[PDB]
Structure 1
Amino acid sequence: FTSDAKDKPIGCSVAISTYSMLGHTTKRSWEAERVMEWLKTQEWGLMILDEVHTIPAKMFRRVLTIVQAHCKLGLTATLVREDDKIVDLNFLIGPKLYEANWMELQNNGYIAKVQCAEVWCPMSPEFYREYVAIKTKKRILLYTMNPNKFRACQFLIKFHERRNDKIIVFADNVFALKEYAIRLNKPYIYGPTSQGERMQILQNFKHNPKINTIFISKVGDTSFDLPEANVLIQISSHGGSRRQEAQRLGRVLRAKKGMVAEEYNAFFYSLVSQDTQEMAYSTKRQRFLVDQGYSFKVITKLAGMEEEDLAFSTKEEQQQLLQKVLAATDLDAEEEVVA
């Protein structure tokens, strides 16, 4: 029951629905006359909230008033809600019933130990020209397309592929993620990617062991049916909410079967350009991670980052990349839409 799709009140037994449909101010459609009057009439024996930690007071108050369910159960990712603000709406549901300790999940392998790391890549002199000169947000590509960041990304991906670790690569920009995945010759998914073209990749990643690394647009910041992976790398450490980043990180990362004895059986990477606006979000992520108890480290260089064949090894290819970045418009350099 959601205006994005056809719905079936007749003989329903479990209505699964979207708050923004139900907490409307005024009817969305005749389909709201169909369902909302019907839903206002039903008395559900139990209400399950999957994202109560994200719903605003007004939408929750409207929903609770409309349904009047006999029991309500609030499911949350984190106790502190981004919409908690002055009033903790949790009391509308009731006390906290239980809290699974991060240590109990890690000690029992339910949630893998995630290696949080940041590749603090030194800024390239040429990119530094453009970084300080470009005060506008077109600067985003400069920290994102630094050869140091690309070469480190390429190595670690090929490393995690050698380990046959399922890995997903995420970025804040269309051109950046495209140029990476294209030059790396790896799958990339975007909004225009048709479901069959998308499923071809997903099935060959979720089940076929050949595809170890896939590239996913900023859409991964939200529900885009992201697959399961053991390693995640942020091409940009620039990003939004720390909790939403942490939510995404846990959503995708899964314990690598049989590797729990290793230092880590899950890995997270976020790539950082030194002396750039990325370092604050990097620092705040670093802090928020250690605050949340996650293990963290910083990376600058590791074996193979220069001992292996990696792109842009010559000044000209670096120049072509930088000129292609400079020739790209602000739109191609701006933050990729999330949808």
Structure 2
Amino acid sequence: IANVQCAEVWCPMTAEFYQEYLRETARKRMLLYIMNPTKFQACQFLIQYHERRGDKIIVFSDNVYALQEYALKMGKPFIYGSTPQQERMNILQNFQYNDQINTIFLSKVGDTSIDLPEATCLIQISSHYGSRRQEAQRLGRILRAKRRNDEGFNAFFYSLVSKDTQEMYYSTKRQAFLVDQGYAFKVITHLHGMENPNLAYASPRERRELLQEVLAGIEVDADNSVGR
């Protein structure tokens, strides 16, 4: 069946983002480790790497502010709570059947339930308190073998983690849980050859633009999307 490589990708906090992360005490600070430009660049690189392989990729964001900043910047479709049934089905049908559209962004509305589509790669932008078990379930529902029976791994799960933030605490936990569940698991601190790609936020000024936008957000913007 699907043979899944699980990885955490540890990304340093940009010093400007780390500065504010410390100073801010309300849940607003979650947005600084979520939008950290090193983490965005890692996500962007992984989408490029996998799209070159014609893999299908779902990127999960539990936070709507982040869902849009990522998807719109990377020019990928996104689905969340207010997305109409018609537009949602357009996007899912595109993901499933149109070879030009192989990456989509989905929020907490994905699990569960509408029918999560199948993919070969699942990237989680964030990690939080506290459901290790909902993560493995979603991984299981989404990931299908890329049709590479010879290969060691034919599907891929990545969880992006910001260093020096509360995100890391969730890591020793996730690693233990996933391996105990029978998964191959590793920690990636440096993505081989990100410097051969043209990724966003190469300049301090572009990072500062995003930083201003994050600082303008409120504690409400840093809550997970809730849905019943």
**Is the 1:238–1:282 Cα contact (8 Å) retained in structure 2?**
no
Tell me the equivalent position of 1:238: 128
- Structure 2 matches for 1:50-69, cutoff 5 A? none
In structure 1, which of residues 271, 281, 290 is the aligned counterpart of residue 160 of structure 2?
A: 271
Which residue of structure 1 aligns with residue 53 of structure 2?
A: 163
Deviation, structure 1 residue 304: 3.1
Alignment of 1:289-328 (within 5 A): 289-328=178-217
> CA separation in 2, counterparts of 1:165 and 1:240?
29
Listed as ranges, the matches of 1:14-163 within 5 Å are: 109=1, 112-163=2-53
Report deviation, 1:296.
0.4
Give 1:239 deviation, angstroms: 4.8
Question: Deviation per CA, 1:276-327, whole angstroms, max 9, x where unpaired?
Answer: 1111112211110111121001112223312211011100110011110111
State the Cα distance separating 1:140 from its structure 2 match: 1.0
For 2:72, the equivalent position in structure 1 comes to: 182
Q: 1:213 aligned to 103, 128, 131, which one?
A: 103
Kept in 1: contact 2:81–2:227 (CA 8 A): no
Name the CA distance, whole Å, in 2 between partners of 1:247 and 1:338.
Answer: 18
Structure 2 equivalent of residue 24 of structure 1: none
Amino acid of the structure 1 residue aligned with 2:116? L
Gaps of 5+ in 1: 1-108
CA change 1:169–1:239 in 2 (3 A) is farther
Q: Contact 1:114 / 1:265 at 8 angstroms: preserved in 2?
A: yes
Compute the TM-score of the two structures, normalised by the length of structure 2. Answer: 0.96
Q: Give CA-to-partner distance per residue, 1:64-111, whole Å, 9 cap, x none.
A: xxxxxxxxxxxxxxxxxxxxxxxxxxxxxxxxxxxxxxxxxxxxx2xx
Does the residue aligned with 1:282 lie in a helix, a strand or coil? Answer: helix
Verify the 8 A CA contact 1:221 1:338 in the aligned structure 2: no
Q: Quick one: which amino acid aligns to residue 335 of structure 1? A: N
TM-superposed deviation, 1:128: 1.0
Tell me the matched-pair count.
Answer: 228
Query: 2:187 is matched by which residue type in structure 1?
Result: V
- CA distance in structure 1 between the aligned counterparts of 2:130 and 2:227, rounded to whole angstroms: 11
Amino acid at match of 1:235: I
Report the Cα distance in structure 2 between the residues aligned to 1:240 and 1:260, rounded to whole angstroms: 35
Match of 2:170 among 281, 289, 303: 281
2:143 aligns to what? 253
Using structure 1 for the length normalisation, give the TM-score.
Answer: 0.65
Question: Cα deviation per residue 1:215-249 (whole Å; 9 max; x = unaligned)?
Answer: 00122232222111111000002253111110111
Does the CA-based 8 Å contact 1:118-1:271 persist in structure 2?
A: yes
Distance 2:170 2:70 in 1: 22
State the Cα distance separating 1:207 from its structure 2 match.
1.5
Secondary structure (helix, strand or coil) at the match of 2:161 reads strand
Question: Quick one: distance in 2 between partners of 1:285 and 1:220?
Answer: 20
Give the RMSD, CA atoms, in angstroms.
Answer: 1.2
Does the residue aligned with 1:324 lie in a helix, a strand or coil?
Answer: helix
Q: Secondary structure at the match of 1:308?
A: coil
- AA aligned to 1:129 is Q
Runs of 4+ in 1 over 6 A off after TM superposition: none
RCO comparison, higher one (Cα < 8 Å, 6+):
2
- The letter of the residue matching 2:223 is E
Structure number with larger C-alpha Rg: 1
Deviates more, 1:201-210 or 1:173-182: 201-210
CA distance in 1, matches of 2:45, 2:103: 12
